[PDB]
Amino acid sequence: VSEQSLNGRWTLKFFPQPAVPVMTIEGAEAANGIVVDAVVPGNVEIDMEAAGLVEDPMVGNNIYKLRPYEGYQWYYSRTFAAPVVTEGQRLVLHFGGIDTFAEVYVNGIKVGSADNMLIEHDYDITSVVKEGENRLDVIIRSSVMEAQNHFLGTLSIGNFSNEESAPVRRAPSTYGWDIMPRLVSAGLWRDVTLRVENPVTIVDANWVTLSVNPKAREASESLYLQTRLPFEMHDKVKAVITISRDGRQILRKEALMRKFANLFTLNLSGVDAWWPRGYGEPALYTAEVSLVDVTSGKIYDTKTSKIGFRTVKLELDEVNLPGQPGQFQFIINGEPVFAKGTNWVPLDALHSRDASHVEEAVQLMVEMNCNIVRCWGGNVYEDTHFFELCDKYGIMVWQDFAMGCGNYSQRDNFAAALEKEAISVVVKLRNHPSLILWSGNNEPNNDRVSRQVLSRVIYEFDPTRPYLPSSRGYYKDPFYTENPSQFVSQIGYHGCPNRETLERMFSPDSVNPWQNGVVGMWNDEWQTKANRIYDDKFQGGRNDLMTNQVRIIFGEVPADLDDFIFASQSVQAEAMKFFVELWRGRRPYRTGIIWWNIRDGWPLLSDAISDYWGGKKQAFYYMQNVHHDVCCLINPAANGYMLKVDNNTLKDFEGVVEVKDVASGKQVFKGKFVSKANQMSEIATLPMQKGQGMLVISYRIEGNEYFNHYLYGEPPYKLDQYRKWVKKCGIYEL
Amino acid sequence: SHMFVSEQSLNGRWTLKFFPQPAVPVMTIEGAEAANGIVVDAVVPGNVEIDMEAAGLVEDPMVGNNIYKLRPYEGYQWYYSRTFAAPVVTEGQRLVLHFGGIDTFAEVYVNGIKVGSADNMLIEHDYDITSVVKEGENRLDVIIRSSVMEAQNHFLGTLSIGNFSNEESAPVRRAPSTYGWDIMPRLVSAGLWRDVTLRVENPVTIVDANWVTLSVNPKAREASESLYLQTRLPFEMHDKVKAVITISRDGRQILRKEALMRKFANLFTLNLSGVDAWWPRGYGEPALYTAEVSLVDVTSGKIYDTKTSKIGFRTVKLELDEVNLPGQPGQFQFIINGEPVFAKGTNWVPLDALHSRDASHVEEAVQLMVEMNCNIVRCWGGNVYEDTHFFELCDKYGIMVWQDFAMGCGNYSQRDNFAAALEKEAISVVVKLRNHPSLILWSGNNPNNDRVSRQVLSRVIYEFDPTRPYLPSSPGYYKDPFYTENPSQFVSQIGYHGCPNRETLERMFSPDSVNPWQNGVVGMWNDEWQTKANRIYDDKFQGGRNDLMTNQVRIIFGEVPADLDDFIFASQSVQAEAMKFFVELWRGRRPYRTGIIWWNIRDGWPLLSDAISDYWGGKKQAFYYMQNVHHDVCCLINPAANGYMLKVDNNTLKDFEGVVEVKDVASGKQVFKGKFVSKANQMSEIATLPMQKGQGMLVISYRIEGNEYFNHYLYGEPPYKLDQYRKWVKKCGIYEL
Prior knowledge:
This is part of a larger assembly, with 2 copies of chain A. The first copy, chain A, is of the alpha+beta class.
């Protein structure tokens, strides 16, 4: 009926938390602290940096300066004008995100308490609001100190996930990880609105695709409609269901409301199925349900969403390692699909800025041609707009519940707070066709959280998607080339980011990685930029992976910064391309490959192919030519090489292919291949070449020339000769 | 027979005030009297529509489309009010207000003090009103709220939305049928539907007396009974009260045991001799023994409490089958007292949509199963758990009972709040009924991840009734392979439609609607005939469930008659032949088949249904056909691949001899005659009969121990001439028009 936004400029008052959390407006106002101007949605640090109280945490060795504020309390306060409500209307205050532990007041009357950061919090403030100006106050307390209110188990201590994160329901990466800083932060990081609800309102509209037939263009969509219906409005309200696409109506059904909950089955015709990238087009149809009066025609409530007709099933392998992880394949609309995609790490430590990055970051997966994406359980749950873009661009979604690496409490209190979070996120996202699977991310089979709690929520609230109770040297080491997992989550390879980002994330005297000139030893800022979480001065650790991989492939490690960037990005590009080629090259058995990762969430040194500021590394372009729907590649063989072609679509393709040595120009093979649909077809057994070099391949499919290469030989290689081969190949630059 | 020192009844004339429920429901006496409502005279035990039909507030729902008129009352509140005289209580005594039934959500008040809040209509509710009652006149107030609006205080799951069970029935603990089914009308109703009494308990009182049969030897007349007695015993009365156990039958005392109460809970192991076992119908006698336990002072001899009940020495065991379909429901057999019994009985659907009238129907409805000779009955989980008197009659006539927990066909919640309500309900009904020898099995109906069926209800049976099995899963042409090739050994035979007797049609339908065909066109039904096929909600359509009546008479008799009397004979004969064929098919396919539970012997409302008897006791033609195929020893004929097959079935533990004569009723030509030896508790094939020509009927006349019994078998293939089938029936002489 009405949704007045409460986003804007608020009043933030922060002060160190005493031994007893204030938890009262009086206490908060009486506390001696600093008052600055805030912005909702926003994270406290942003409101302080705009006021000049803190320095930029994204520049080198400044993330640590935000340490004392992890034990501070925050006091958001504003005034709003309440809307006039008629008899029977509700007035709901909606918070999209409170980080995290906070008490909510309306006109000095507590209307609720917040204990989660990943889900929404709604409060009925109808009987507490006055006419005219009303006051709204929330009192956030230290999340780190809330952990000491619980007794951890032996399993919950010592894991990479910080022990302060085990008893609380916040994103584990905020407490620190290999790929993101320790910036716990706090605040209203999402929208804050006011809603008016008529006595006849729609509580939930759950769209479920029973069946779908791509041929003959048929589908069967069900609507699980739950409504709040006063008994005098029974038999007097009718539900109006409308399926449309680009204004054109496809189906319209009306039925009289005779009970609060109903199941309306719709057998549609002339509709297209929703397919992931390559295997078809993302067909979306606007589905709208309305509760209107049969007499006056008044529209009491209307809910609208873009749905898609898709059936998902997880076929488990029962021959090759029947119980081991990875022995599964996704079946979409009866067709077994091959999954190639990235892992979705946080878009920002200050998660209030995630909404601004979701548009450009999803476009990274579009150019990358990813048909899947796994939202890592260390990040907050993305909002509905992320799933709307994944619906639009046909990128399937693998959602992990927000639980990091480690075991969690087995007691009733933790299981209750988790069930509340699970039911909230499931009902919110169970209508997006991109979403295909929920996961527990355990790595025995006794964790109640993974085999009783998160399972039971899916059993009752989402029976359409499957639930899984559980999830460094030479890239050709048998460790990689013999992993029996059909479906794999390949680890990343470290790569120095682009030079432009180095000069922005590091101070001018620390841009050079080698401190005092000695190659191999990293300065303090370069050590901090791998997170380090706490400022424990030391040498080595994670950054040594960058020089070890450069040493394995290119003999030594260069001293010049420009040459070292080319080295680290090349060993990352060839490694990732080799991993994707290997799994696509065994596609009859290999079922999918998700890799790590496509974009960072902070200016840090990492194993990603693109940084926070959009600086695409070389590994992005190498793998972009290996994610094409129809792609030719070369895999190592027992007695030579093997030229293959993989097809991740439902259509057959024909074309020619020409491979030849780039160092000399001698042609190795040229022929005509027939790439059958949804399979890998072997072209010919290319003969083993001699020494080292690179084989440039060029295949034409339906009047379009595509390119790819293959590095042959055994390391070490001369770096100036690899740059010579890449430039003469004429595919990638730098 | 729990001898409380005082039990004063509060049943009788009450004061009912009903009014539409506002946004926030009324829960206080202040708001109840202040609400603008309507006051009439009520009767307890009773339902609100019974009290409103009196004084002319509503027309008879049992007649024509008058039911849907009760719709606005589903959002009404109901305020029962009364005044009672408090009995005198000595120091240490307790005054308990007993409620046998409260449909459903309600707040109970005594002298303006809330003594209780209710949320279930299937379990009893007791409250201690010692510290709230005064002397003389006390006021009793009950404020019942709308059950339908309570469902909107819960969020249902995808599974709970869209089942044959109303979505409103899932979050609430009420009989699912009330919200409307296909065999019972929509009538949520409300009101105190069972007794309301005042009880005075002594400080020394019996909390529970649980009788358990550990072993039984029918030969030599031996048994081993256990008594799990829990009492309320003040510590100063320890070592001063003795328990007196008395097992007796027909006045003669079998066992008497005295023991000093040295603790509140005890177990008494009894090894009796000269006692008979309790058997179902056919397999023996329903031997019952009156069991009495008393708490009496060892010095003064004053009896503080006595609890008496009749029990039966019987052991039940469910034998599973891991050879043919290991794990599929229907592969089991009941073993009573070491013998595998064949179950032939009915499903038990509600006796009345206004369940306050159920108690008046149990006596006659049970008698229907006695003449029917049912050794088993399955109380459907849409009815309300019946009261002790129903199980007492099953104990008396040897009818085993299969009780299903009141759960709907659909899936339910898996959260803690619903499970807590269901555990309370399960413990209450189990402790109440765990002493009846008739009860043999509990079922939760309903993958296997359901907390309700595979945890909540199982845990209860585990701790409170480990003597009975618990099953966590339960369920055109009548010779179609859909019926004749059913994999289940223990089957729940789906019923066939049958037009009720003519006298019923004239009483339930208006005079202008007694004829079924509106506008005279055969095949189309008038609105009343559409509603009486149970159309929960008043949505006008054509056909639907009623079309099954004409489809069956069209397959069997070619064309549906245009005369009402001939249409009755058609629909009742296609049901009589179908259900007779289903029972003869399972009784003839033993020992693989283990039992058949047909649906249904009696309806709970004047409706057109698949039953063999209507709400007013009108036995349809199928009722008499089934009686000749439900005898202890029965001769029948089954279809074979290259002919027929004359068989005899025995559901007793005794052998029998006799002679059988099968002849063609039309020609009079004898097809077979000879002596047969029916061994006990098994099926014996007599001989293969040659394939008779054309259509007709074979009459079976077999005598056993100087008693002539009769049966028949209709051969040929449909369609048949209706007047020729009537000719064949009259020629047999077994049944009547």
